[PDB]
Amino acid sequence: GAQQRELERMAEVLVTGEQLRLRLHEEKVIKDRRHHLKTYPNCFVAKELIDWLIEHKEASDRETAIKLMQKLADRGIIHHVCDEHKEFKDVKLFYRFRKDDGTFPLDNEVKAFMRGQRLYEKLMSPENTLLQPREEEGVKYERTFMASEFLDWLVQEGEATTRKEAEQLCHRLMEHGIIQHVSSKHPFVDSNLLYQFRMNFRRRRRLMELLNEKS
User: Fold this and answer.
1) Do 190 and 4 contact (CB within 8 A), yes or no?
2) Which of 9, 38, 75, 84 has the greatest count of CB atoms below 10 A from its CB?
3) Is 30 within 8 Å of 98 (Cβ atoms)?
4) Class of the CATH-defined domain 108-197
């Protein structure tokens, strides 16, 4: 129980950080920037991001905005572009998302959540209606999939090169609480059995959730 809850807290930070990284690229808060005759690619200015967080009503004041970003720095989501400041400071210093320079601190559980995120985005797209409601024993379940059909899809979509690899991915998703069997706890089996996502990758997190307990 405790370990699953801790992983879920980890997943909330990964999802929140990633949702933010994408918005800041689209808004051009992250871009290539000059300082002392050099160009620093894919970075943001700390003081500017604080301005932006307040403008977009993600934080009420600078003090709180800073706590939000310090959390992302502590969690390995962002870092100073030259690794010269562990503190997130409200000044003209440049910081970068670790995904954007290939320095993200990876482990097997992080990898699973990132795969899950990438999968779920596809399952939310207008062209994909694999996830379907199903009823079993007078109870209706939302957004279900048959295990076998989900493996077919993973290979079709290029998320796995083979069915074995697709099955292994699903075992990892199950292990880390990302998917679950419908109705009762059960392992993932390539089969007629029904599963659904347990982790929610759709919801737009409020950045203030980063100050939630044990985040």
Assistant:
1) no
2) 75
3) no
4) mainly alpha
What is the maximum span of the chain, computed from C-alpha positions, in angstroms?
A: 68
Yes or no: say if 120 and 197 are a contact pair by the CB < 8 Å rule: yes
Strand partners, 145: 195
* Residue 68 near residue 59, CB atoms below 8 Å: yes
Decide: helix, strand or coil at residue 22: helix
Tokens 């989900």 belong to residue: 150
DSSP state of 210: G
Which residues are 38's β-sheet partners?
35
Structural determination approach = X-ray
**Domain positions in the chain:** 1-106+204-211, 108-197
Residue 38 in 3-state DSSP?
strand
The CATH classification of domain 1-106+204-211, taken from the options 2.60.40.10, 3.40.190.10, 1.10.260.40, 1.10.10.10: 1.10.10.10
- H or E element that contains 25: helix 2-26
Burial class, 24, CB count within 10 angstroms (exposed 0-12 / middle 13-18 / buried 19+): middle
Query: Looking at this protein, which amino acid is placed at residue 156?
Result: Q
CA atoms within 13 A on the CB side of 20: 29
Resolution (Å) of this entry: 1.5
